[PDB]
Symmetry: C2
Subunit: 195 residues, 2 copies
């Protein structure tokens, strides 16, 4: 019964530098990721994400970016921007790191390791190949015509503080903050229907 | 001029399962870590930490725990509890992982890797050997008579959302939440004065 937004809305929102929320399907016990495109990371957007999520910020990336950066060739890998930051943990610093990761001119030496941002390598083919939030993030940036790099983190429950938000609460959060809530099931369906 | 709390207060608070805040010294531009003892991790305490910090939760550990667990022998290392959790990211899940890390009966196989908690290896000798927040955390648990394992994360600025809180704001946060704010400088001084 939970209302779900459309893939068209999600894609336009991502293109506009907005965030969306992504869950697996209509199951009422799904956790959900706040997702935006990494090139659209600003201090304000990352602050919002850190405020409402676990803070364990990840950056899904196309394999080609990973390979370009000498990361995650086909222990957890972490990175910070080498330049333009302080300690690497602030919303403004992680936003810089995220934009750098999405920047096709960046190279391996533009990052210090270890760091405070967690890159993840998306499977080629996106959600049609692996129905993960990692793949959903990259697919959405690609569909919005952006560089194939996203930023993801899971939304904390405000009702049950020990927990992560489930589908009904995620619906409320999305409505309150003017955001789209979509499922990977629907994104798969859309991608199948439109080549 | 910023009022600082005493090492005696910090240690009693840690013993009582409370959190404290630790900065380097009286410099007004220091960032500060919220710190509690890992065995004192509860869903409520980790929820508080996640709410007000970067969410990039770390667990300073004595070398002996690290060695016992096959972690960080003398890429970033991450762990989750194998048992008793869901996805590993909730406040309740990370609290379980933290308690397990502090539990002297746990072994390597009690953890799955990778995970969502970041262990850090404290230098033997604590802040007298390396004046880090990692060392401060372990020293405080030891001084409180607890297992040498802590939980740390940096407090986000509520005044300037892109930033981390500095000394004056940290003073306000500590006062508002009934917490001690101490410096590593004073902890070093205390430890030197009392063998
Ligand atoms: K937070
Ligand atoms: K948070």
């Amino acid at each position: 019964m939970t209302r779900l937004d459309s893939v068209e809305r999600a894609v336009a929102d991502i293109a506009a530098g907005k965030a969306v929320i992504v869950i697996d399907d209509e199951d009422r016990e799904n956790e959900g990721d706040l997702i935006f495109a990494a090139e659209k990371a600003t201090p304000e957007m990352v602050a919002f994400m850190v405020r409402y999520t676990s803070g364990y910020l990840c950056v899904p990336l196309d394999g080609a970016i990973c390979d370009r950066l000498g990361l995650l060739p086909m222990y957890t890998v972490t990175v910070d921007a080498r330049n333009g930051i302080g300690t690497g943990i602030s919303a403004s610093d992680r936003a810089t790191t995220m934009r750098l990761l999405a920047d096709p001119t960046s190279v391996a030496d533009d990052f210090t390791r270890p760091g405070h941002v967690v890159p993840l390598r998306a499977k080629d083919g996106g959600v049609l190949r692996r129905p993960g939030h990692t793949e959903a993030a990259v697919d959405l940036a690609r569909m919005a015509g952006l560089q194939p790099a996203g930023a993801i983190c899971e939304i904390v429950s405000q009702k049950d503080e020990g927990s992560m938000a489930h589908t009904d609460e995620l619906r409320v959060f999305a409505d309150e903050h003017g955001l789209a809530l979509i499922t990977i099931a629907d994104l798969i369906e859309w991608r199948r229907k439109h080549e």
